[model samples]
Target: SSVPSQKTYQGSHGFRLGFLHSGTAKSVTCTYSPALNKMFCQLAKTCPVQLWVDSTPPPGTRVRAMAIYKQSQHMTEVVRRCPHHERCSDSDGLAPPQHLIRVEGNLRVEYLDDRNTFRHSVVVPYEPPEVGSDCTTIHYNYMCNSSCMGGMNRRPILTIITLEDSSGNLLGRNSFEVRVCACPGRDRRTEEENLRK
Candidate 1:
């Protein structure tokens, strides 16, 4: 994918990178708030990560997935980047959100800014995963019995929305791809009783 075609972003309606050129028909459009500067998005391919990754058949049994981080809003206060490299168009490393599937939640990061905001804990910090302006529909829980899926079933989550200007800084490189697995029997008990009742 080797993307870096004149990478420019410093002004003049410059949020038009368009997920490097594909995937995101209408979902990941962000800017949940933080004095609001800009928040454009397109990758982390949504549509429930393309309809459960569409392979439905060889994984014995086991399932659960919900990850809903509609962040609450403390908005960023320090270090986190990825405005250049994203999704699949390859730009690689600046760190964060690298999971080859198998994600669990109820997140509780203790030393990294005293975190706690997964679906109503409202304790903020842990990378612009905001809280306190209203909108922390946080929740997480992941697993899929397709043993191989534990290796990967696409679980992207690279969302950076910061405008904490000490002067000359901003981030809103959003990503929200999520795929767990779906295949067993009885519609896997009807998606385990419809993915969380």
Candidate 2:
């Protein structure tokens, strides 16, 4: 869910962090608080993480769960993190418009410096179920690291996932944003410090 105001938190790595919700009131509010960051980061590195909202939450209330991962090296580990093996519940009731096809996996996005944008491709890693042989659903991770791109660390990246069927029909789209490390150096600096520099 969109916070009334942008909220910032401290990551376990001693870095300041902020969340970019799914452009709605039902999206998860990803945050960092020492232990929570550790567990969530580990979960992100070890497997594909899934977050959801209550069947019916109070109005104006933020989402019930959240997650975040910035390390590009852990991108490959995302697929292993799927505890929901299949597409989980739809975000329809929890958020707004319902999705026709439930996204069952994770998403892997790579930052492209040339275009200063993120790019991803959809693919089916497993065999189609008996019921929907023509339809394809997938999940992947998204990560970016650029050493020469000056503002790469401070730039905010938007990752969007679109679901499609075998005939190449659009199912739905889900998107979120992540602010990269402001100080892309060995020594971590607070958000304020980075802003001043």
Candidate 3:
């Protein structure tokens, strides 16, 4: 069940960072779009070189889990030393709604060091509000037989979404694939049917 909100963008805000303190309810957030600028600023003050990883299950499966990793102390130091660190705190919690906001129209994101009031800001033609869940149900199973014979089937789903710059430029794309297995009966059918559906 890959929902648009559950999906990760390949362009700018794809791998944004969030800072979580022990007592704070909302974690500060930052995006990977501006590269490592904002990330180092906020995270360095909190967990340090921690990384936020996005993961997804098969299309039909309901179980979807995203991962977040805290980098080693040594790595945090290295990231700290990076010349241009924005140290942004823009997103929070497991897959924030900001991740789902599909930016439409022309958009432009630039890093500005105006006065230190705001670490950075994004320039968009218009702001896109959060959208509702776009979950899709997928059926990839066959009916059961009296003898309980099952088949092997496989279908590949591309999970990557190429992000577009404000000027409609190609920033980059994120690509991922999943393999599904179905075996509800005791009797075995053809190997090809199990996954290659």
Candidate 4:
């Protein structure tokens, strides 16, 4: 008919899951469609993905892959919220602006192979510094230059960060969106247009 049935999964610490579409059998091949906000899985007797809860597979159980989409949106919001400043070039027109955004969140990553076995699981915390004590925030920087303008000028990038307990049970997951602002020049564009662009 449409696809298969669905299921709801809730773990500790307010983690919840929703299945979009699924099929029957032991193996399922999942493909994501961002436009529809869904992950469609095609079932097979021996595909690659083998989903299990307590060492059992749920045939035709569609699982929502919200983490993938949420991570992307979160990064974009971070970049838009961060402040940016540009320094004029001595002779050239304008040097690209430097951008810095502080990110704080938890992330989790689980890796699988062709056999559907867990290969690696990593958890990382990207919480910002306390600003008072316990300055554990790491510092990293980079320099970039470009000529293009418009939607792609910001040079947006994504960084996935995983967070989990010692046993790697996936406490939470998130990502960072780092974007560099375009340099300011004597162009006739309005201030609003420049920032908005």
Candidate 5:
């Protein structure tokens, strides 16, 4: 045989991704019903988002998206594991204070227009970095925040994107938060509770 042929790598060392919900937000805060754990967005269905995965997504890397609820309950379970840097990045309050938990069958991503979903068991197409950067972009709808709780303070819910290799191992990981508003942000149309009742 001729000289041994070359074998290109199909794995990534690591990667990062950030979001621009509706292409106009660095971070978002959605109020949720503690009893239901669903975001206030439930009323408006206003959680559609667009995310950009840039920089490096080494060839052959596959992508998967997931929404993780409950930042602390899962974190305690350390129970688990696990960056993104951009002008369209998030504030310091977006991420969790402890470990990340991505369990199966807890939450599902309502991919913007498509009906095909991995349901926490498959991968989407490969997202190369941006142009000059082989960057990749994505679309989907956001759901409830991380967990269910009642308070004046708002917490963050994790929406994570994982880049995996053909071997089904994680190559790179990135996440963000839809801060889960406690009530009060910007242009709100409507809500519950009387101030002085």
Candidate 6:
């Protein structure tokens, strides 16, 4: 039997996605395995997560996500590539103790051109800015820690959210959770090794 190889996007801007395994963590570390060449990240803790798409997703893009809980009976099934922020909001909400914590998942884009890459962005949650700040900002420059090796493409931007999951049996049923922010921060450098190892 002859099997033909599949030709996917090979352009410089194509955002490749592979599933990253997660651990039962509080104050967790995340990493992207280049050997897998998969776009991935880790959190110091598991929190209720919500995925928001900045804009309308292209025709063929795909995203799959689910919550991996230990000791808890609830688990999130790999859903779909969210089209916009509203879609993400509607999918799942914090039920009792199940809130949204931002984690990494399998979501990739294959575009013929680079301009469309904006469709993909890293959304991590972090502490809000000091007072006198009103709007949320998604940071991209200065701290582009890419999981991609060889500087192949734009490093995915991420946000971290801290919350509590009341119904979850994992953290002794603790409610602390994490959220995905709309930007990346500079504080994650030293912990890279802690996360990688």
CA lDDT of every candidate: 0.24, 0.25, 0.23, 0.26, 0.36, 0.24
Q: Report the CA-based lDDT of candidate 4 relative to the real structure.
A: 0.26
Q: Arrange candidates by TM-score, highest first: which order?
A: 5, 2, 4, 1, 6, 3
Residue-wise C-alpha lDDT for candidate 5, range 75-156, written one tens digit per residue: 3221111111112233223322222222222132222211343122224557454458444554343322223333211344
Using lDDT as the measure, what is the rank order of every candidate, best first? 5, 4, 2, 6, 1, 3
Tell me the TM-score of model 4: 0.24
Candidate 6 per-residue lDDT, tens place, 1-197, comes to 11111123222322222223443233434332333222233322222222222232233332222222111221212111223322334322211112222232222211111132212222233223247843223211111123222221222322211121222111111111111222212223333445678
Count steric clashes of candidate 5. Answer: 8
C-alpha RMSD between model 3 and the true structure: 22.5
Q: What digit string (tens of lDDT, one per residue) describes model 4 on residues 1-197? A: 11111123233433322232333222333332223323222211111111222221122222211111123333223221112222322211121232221211222322121133211112123232355733232222222221223222434344233333444344433333322223211111233245567
How much is 77 displaced in model 6, in angstroms?
Answer: 10
Superposed on all Cα atoms, the candidates' RMSDs to the truth, in angstroms, are 19.4, 17.1, 22.5, 19.5, 15.8, 18.2
Worst 10 residues of 3 by lDDT: 74-83
Instruction: Quote each prediction's TM-score.
Output: 0.19, 0.28, 0.18, 0.24, 0.41, 0.19
Error of 2 at 170 (Å): 0.7
Which runs of model 4 end up more than 4 angstroms from their true locations?
1-135, 143-155, 181-197
Per-residue lDDT tens digits of candidate 1, residues 1-197?
11111212323212221221222223323211111211222233121111111122122211222122222231221111122321324322311332222222324321121234221111112222144521222222222211222222232222222111222133212233232233222322343346558
- Among these predicted structures, which one has the highest lDDT? 5
Candidate 2 lDDT, tens digit per residue, 59-150? 32211112222334433221111223123442323221111112233332121111221212233322222463322223322222212132
Off by over 4 Å in 1: 1-92, 96-98, 101-133, 137-179, 182-189, 193-197
Clashes of each: 7, 13, 28, 11, 8, 38
